[PDB]
mmCIF file of C-alpha atoms and ligand atoms in Angstrom:
data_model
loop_
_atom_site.group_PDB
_atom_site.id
_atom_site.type_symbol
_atom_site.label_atom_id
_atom_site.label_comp_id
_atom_site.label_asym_id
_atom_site.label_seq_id
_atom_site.Cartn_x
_atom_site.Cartn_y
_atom_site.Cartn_z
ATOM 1 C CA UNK G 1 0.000 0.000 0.000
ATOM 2 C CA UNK G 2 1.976 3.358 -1.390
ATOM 3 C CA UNK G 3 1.686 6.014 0.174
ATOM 4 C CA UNK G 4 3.349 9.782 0.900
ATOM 5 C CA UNK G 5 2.923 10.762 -2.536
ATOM 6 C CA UNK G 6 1.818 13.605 -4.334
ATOM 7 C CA UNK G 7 -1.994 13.140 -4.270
ATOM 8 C CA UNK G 8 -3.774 12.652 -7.385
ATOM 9 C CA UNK G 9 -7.278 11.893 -7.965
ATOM 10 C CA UNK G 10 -9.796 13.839 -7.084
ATOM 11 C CA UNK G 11 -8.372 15.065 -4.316
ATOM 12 C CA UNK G 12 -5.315 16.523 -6.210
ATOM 13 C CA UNK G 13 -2.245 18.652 -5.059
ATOM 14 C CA UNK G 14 -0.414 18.556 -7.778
ATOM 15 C CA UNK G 15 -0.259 22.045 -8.704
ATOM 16 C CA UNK G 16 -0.379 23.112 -5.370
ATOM 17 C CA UNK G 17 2.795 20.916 -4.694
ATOM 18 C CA UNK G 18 4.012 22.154 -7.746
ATOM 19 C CA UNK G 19 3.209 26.328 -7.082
ATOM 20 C CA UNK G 20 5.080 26.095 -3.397
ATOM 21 C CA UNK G 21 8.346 23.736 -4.917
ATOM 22 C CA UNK G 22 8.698 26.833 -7.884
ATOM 23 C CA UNK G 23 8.055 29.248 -5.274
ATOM 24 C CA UNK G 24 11.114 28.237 -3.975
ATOM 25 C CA UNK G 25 13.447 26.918 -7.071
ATOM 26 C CA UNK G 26 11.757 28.529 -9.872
ATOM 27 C CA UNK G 27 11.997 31.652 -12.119
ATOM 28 C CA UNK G 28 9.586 33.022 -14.596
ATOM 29 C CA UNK G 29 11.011 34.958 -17.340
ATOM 30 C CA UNK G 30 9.313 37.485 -19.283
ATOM 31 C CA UNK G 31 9.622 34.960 -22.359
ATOM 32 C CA UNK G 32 6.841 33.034 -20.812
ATOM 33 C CA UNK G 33 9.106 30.273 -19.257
ATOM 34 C CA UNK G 34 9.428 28.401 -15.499
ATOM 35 C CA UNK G 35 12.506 27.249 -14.946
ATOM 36 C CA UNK G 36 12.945 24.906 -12.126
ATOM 37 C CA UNK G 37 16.454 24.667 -10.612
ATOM 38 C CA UNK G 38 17.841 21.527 -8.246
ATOM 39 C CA UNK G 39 21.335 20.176 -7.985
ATOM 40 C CA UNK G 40 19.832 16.252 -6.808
ATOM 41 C CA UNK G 41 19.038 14.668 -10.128
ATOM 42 C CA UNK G 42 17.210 11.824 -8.286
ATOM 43 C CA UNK G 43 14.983 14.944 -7.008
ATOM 44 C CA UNK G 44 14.734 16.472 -10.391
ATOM 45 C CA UNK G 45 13.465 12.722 -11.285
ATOM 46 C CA UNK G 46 10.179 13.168 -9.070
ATOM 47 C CA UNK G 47 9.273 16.616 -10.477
ATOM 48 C CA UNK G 48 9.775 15.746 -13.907
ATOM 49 C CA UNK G 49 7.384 12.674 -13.239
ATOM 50 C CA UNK G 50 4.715 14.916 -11.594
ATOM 51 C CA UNK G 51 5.020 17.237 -14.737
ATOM 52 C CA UNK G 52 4.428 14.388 -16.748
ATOM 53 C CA UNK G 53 1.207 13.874 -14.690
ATOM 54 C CA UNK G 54 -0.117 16.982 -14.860
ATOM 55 C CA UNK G 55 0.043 17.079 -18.337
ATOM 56 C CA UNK G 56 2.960 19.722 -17.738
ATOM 57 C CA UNK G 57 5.145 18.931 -21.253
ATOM 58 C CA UNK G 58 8.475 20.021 -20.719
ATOM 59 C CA UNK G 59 10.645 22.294 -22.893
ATOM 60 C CA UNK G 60 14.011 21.361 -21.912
ATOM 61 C CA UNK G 61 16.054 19.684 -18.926
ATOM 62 C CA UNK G 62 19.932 20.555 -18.949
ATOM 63 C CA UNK G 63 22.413 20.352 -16.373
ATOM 64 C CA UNK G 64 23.955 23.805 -16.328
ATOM 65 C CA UNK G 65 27.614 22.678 -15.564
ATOM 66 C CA UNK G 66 28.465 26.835 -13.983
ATOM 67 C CA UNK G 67 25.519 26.558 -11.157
ATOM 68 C CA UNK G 68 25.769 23.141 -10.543
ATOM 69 C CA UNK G 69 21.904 22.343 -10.872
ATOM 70 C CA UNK G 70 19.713 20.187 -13.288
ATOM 71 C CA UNK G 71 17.074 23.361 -14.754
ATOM 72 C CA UNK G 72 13.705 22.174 -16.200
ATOM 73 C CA UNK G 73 12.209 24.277 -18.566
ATOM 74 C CA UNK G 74 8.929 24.541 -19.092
ATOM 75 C CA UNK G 75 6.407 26.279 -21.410
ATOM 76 C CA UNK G 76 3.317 26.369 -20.122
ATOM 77 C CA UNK G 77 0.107 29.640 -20.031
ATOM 78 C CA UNK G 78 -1.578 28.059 -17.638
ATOM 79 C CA UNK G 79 0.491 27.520 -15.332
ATOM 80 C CA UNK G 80 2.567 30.514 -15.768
ATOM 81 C CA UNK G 81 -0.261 32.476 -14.973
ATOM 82 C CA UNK G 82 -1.580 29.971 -12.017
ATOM 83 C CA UNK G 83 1.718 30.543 -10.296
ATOM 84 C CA UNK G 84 1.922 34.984 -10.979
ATOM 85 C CA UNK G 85 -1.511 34.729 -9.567
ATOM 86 C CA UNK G 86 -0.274 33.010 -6.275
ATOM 87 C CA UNK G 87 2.739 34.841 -5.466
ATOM 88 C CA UNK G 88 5.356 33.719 -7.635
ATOM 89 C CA UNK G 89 6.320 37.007 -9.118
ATOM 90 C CA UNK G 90 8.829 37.074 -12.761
ATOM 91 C CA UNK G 91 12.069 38.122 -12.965
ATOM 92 C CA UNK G 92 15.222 37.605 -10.801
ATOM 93 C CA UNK G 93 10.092 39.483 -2.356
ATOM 94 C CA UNK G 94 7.805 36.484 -3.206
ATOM 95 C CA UNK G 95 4.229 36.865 -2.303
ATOM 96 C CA UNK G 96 2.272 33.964 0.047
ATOM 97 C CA UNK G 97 0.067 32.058 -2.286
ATOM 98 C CA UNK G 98 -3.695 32.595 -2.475
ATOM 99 C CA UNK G 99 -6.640 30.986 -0.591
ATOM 100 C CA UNK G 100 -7.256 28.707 -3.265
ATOM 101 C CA UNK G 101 -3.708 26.782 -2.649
ATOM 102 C CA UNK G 102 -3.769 24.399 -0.588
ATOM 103 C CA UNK G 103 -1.644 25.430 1.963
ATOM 104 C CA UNK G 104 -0.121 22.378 3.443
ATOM 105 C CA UNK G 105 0.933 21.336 -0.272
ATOM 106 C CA UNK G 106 2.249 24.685 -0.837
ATOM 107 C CA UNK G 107 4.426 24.717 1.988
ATOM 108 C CA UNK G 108 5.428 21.003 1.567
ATOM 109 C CA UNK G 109 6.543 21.816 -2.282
ATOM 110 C CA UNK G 110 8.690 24.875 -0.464
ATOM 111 C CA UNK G 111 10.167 22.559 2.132
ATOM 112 C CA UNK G 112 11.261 20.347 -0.774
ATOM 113 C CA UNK G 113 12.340 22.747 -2.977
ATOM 114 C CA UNK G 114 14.658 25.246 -0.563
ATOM 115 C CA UNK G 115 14.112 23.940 2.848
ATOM 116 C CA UNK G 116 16.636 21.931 4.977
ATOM 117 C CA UNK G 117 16.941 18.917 7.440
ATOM 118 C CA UNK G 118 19.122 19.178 10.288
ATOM 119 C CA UNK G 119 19.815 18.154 13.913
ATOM 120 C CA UNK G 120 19.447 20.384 16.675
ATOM 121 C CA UNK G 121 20.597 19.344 20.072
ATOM 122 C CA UNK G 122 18.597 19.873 23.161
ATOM 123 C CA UNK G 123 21.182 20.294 26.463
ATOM 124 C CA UNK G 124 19.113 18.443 29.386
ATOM 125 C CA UNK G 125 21.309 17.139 32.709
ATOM 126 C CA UNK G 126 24.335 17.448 31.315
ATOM 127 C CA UNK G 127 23.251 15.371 28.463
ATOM 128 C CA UNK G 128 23.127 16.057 24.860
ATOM 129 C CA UNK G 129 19.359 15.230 23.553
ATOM 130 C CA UNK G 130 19.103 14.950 19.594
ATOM 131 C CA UNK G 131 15.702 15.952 17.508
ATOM 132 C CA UNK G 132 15.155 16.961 14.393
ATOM 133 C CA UNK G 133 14.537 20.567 12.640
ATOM 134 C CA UNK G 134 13.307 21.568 9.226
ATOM 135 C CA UNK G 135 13.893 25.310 8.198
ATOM 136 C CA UNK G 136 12.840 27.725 5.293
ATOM 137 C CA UNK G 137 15.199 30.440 4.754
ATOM 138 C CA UNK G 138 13.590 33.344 2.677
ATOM 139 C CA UNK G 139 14.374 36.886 1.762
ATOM 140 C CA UNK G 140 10.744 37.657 1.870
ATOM 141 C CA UNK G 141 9.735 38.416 5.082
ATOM 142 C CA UNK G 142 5.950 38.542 4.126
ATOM 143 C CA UNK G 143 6.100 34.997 3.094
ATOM 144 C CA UNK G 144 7.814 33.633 5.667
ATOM 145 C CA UNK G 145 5.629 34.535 8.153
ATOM 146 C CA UNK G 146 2.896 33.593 6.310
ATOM 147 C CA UNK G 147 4.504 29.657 6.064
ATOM 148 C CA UNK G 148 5.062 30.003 9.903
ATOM 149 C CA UNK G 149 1.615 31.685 10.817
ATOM 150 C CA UNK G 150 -0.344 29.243 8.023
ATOM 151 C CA UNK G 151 1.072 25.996 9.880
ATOM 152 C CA UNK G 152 0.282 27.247 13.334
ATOM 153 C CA UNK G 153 -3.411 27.685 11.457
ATOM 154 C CA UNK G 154 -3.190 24.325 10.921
ATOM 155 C CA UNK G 155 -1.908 23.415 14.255
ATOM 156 C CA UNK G 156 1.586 22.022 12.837
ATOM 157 C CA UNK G 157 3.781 24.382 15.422
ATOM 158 C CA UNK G 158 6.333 26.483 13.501
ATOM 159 C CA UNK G 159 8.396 29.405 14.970
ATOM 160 C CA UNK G 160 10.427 32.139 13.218
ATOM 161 C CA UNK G 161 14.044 33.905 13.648
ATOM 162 C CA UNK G 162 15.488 36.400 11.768
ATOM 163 C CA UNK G 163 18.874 36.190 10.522
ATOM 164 C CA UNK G 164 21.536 38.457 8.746
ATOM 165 C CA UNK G 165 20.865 36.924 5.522
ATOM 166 C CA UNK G 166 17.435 36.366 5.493
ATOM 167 C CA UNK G 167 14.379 35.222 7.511
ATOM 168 C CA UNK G 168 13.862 31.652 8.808
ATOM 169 C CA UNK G 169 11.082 29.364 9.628
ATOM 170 C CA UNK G 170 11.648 26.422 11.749
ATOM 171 C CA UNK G 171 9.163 23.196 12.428
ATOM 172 C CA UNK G 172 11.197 21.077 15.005
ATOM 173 C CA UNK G 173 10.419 17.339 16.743
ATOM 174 C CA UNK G 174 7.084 15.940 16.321
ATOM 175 C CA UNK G 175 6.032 18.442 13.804
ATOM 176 C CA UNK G 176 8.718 17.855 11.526
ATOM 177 C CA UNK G 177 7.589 14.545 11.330
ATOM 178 C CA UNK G 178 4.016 15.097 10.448
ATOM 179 C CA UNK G 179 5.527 16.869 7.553
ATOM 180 C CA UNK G 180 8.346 14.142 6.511
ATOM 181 C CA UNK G 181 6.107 11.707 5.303
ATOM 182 C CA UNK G 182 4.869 14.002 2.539
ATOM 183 C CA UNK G 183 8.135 15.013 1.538
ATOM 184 C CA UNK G 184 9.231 14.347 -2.159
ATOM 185 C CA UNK G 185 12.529 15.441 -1.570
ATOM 186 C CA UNK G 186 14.703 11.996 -0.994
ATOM 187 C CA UNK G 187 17.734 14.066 0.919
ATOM 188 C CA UNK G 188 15.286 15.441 3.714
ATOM 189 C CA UNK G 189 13.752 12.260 4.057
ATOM 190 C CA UNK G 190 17.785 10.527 4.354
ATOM 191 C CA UNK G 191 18.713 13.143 6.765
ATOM 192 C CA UNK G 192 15.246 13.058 8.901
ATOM 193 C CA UNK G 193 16.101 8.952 9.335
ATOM 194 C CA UNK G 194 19.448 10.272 10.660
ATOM 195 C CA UNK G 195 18.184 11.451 13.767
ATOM 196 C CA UNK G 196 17.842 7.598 15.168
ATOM 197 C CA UNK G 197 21.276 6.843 14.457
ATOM 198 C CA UNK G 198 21.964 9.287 17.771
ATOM 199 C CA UNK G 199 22.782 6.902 20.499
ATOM 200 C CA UNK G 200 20.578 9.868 22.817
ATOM 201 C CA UNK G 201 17.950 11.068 20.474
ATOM 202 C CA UNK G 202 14.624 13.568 22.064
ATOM 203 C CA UNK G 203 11.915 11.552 20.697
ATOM 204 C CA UNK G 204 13.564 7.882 19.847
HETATM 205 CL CL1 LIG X 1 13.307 14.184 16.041
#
């Protein structure tokens, strides 16, 4: 029994998915094109399938050798003007996505597309307590608290911090992991197993 896909069906999140992963490694040109950027080909993999699914036909897919990344091109009105309509503004401060994205999927697509996995240490007794953190990092301020305010919405606790470089929003322990299993992206879900190999880990 498969599970912790992108849902299909009629209960769909592709494009949702899809709107909150370009959100955060896509950029619409004035041309007309989305071009999605990730340096894991096995990631680039599962968004060229889900292209494929949503009848998304796909331009080109090159591995620009400068950046480092796989870019998938793609050529498509609708969905050009399905993701300027819900924040995902052309050229080179992103806007939160409207109230007809699903939210969750949004965010999910975001986490997969820029977010991170990591280990953060609790210090309890003199003892070093492991658990796990994922974080968005994003220049926009607006949408960042909008990802951290939307999940506390949905009562998946996130908090915020704001850093040099940018502003962050963090969903640690538990709440990570009622995210991970949704995940697309195979290095957060690599890194989130991690966590157990901690001879003192929080929640294991
Ligand atoms: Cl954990």
């Amino acid at each position: 029994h498969s599970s912790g896909l992108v849902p299909r069906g009629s209960h769909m999140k592709v494009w949702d998915y899809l709107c909150g992963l370009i959100a955060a490694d896509g950029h619409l040109d004035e041309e007309g094109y989305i071009t999605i950027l990730q340096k894991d080909r096995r990631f680039i993999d599962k968004i060229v399938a889900l292209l494929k699914s949503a009848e998304i036909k796909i331009s080109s897919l090159f591995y620009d050798k400068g950046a480092g990344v796989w870019k998938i091109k793609v050529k498509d009105e609708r969905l050009y003007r399905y993701l300027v309509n819900n924040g995902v503004i052309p050229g080179k401060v992103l806007r939160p996505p409207s109230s007809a994205v699903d939210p969750l999927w949004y965010i999910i697509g975001f986490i997969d597309g820029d977010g991170w996995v990591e280990q953060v240490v609790k210090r309890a007794g003199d003892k070093s307590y492991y658990y796990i953190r994922i974080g968005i990092k994003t220049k926009s301020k607006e949408l960042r608290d909008w990802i951290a305010q939307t999940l506390n919405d949905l009562g998946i606790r996130a908090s915020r911090a704001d850093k040099s470089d940018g502003y962050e929003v963090h969903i640690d322990g538990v709440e990570a992991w009622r995210l991970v299993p949704h995940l697309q992206n195979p290095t957060h879900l690599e890194r989130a197993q991690s966590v157990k190999d901690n001879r003192l880990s929080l929640l294991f």
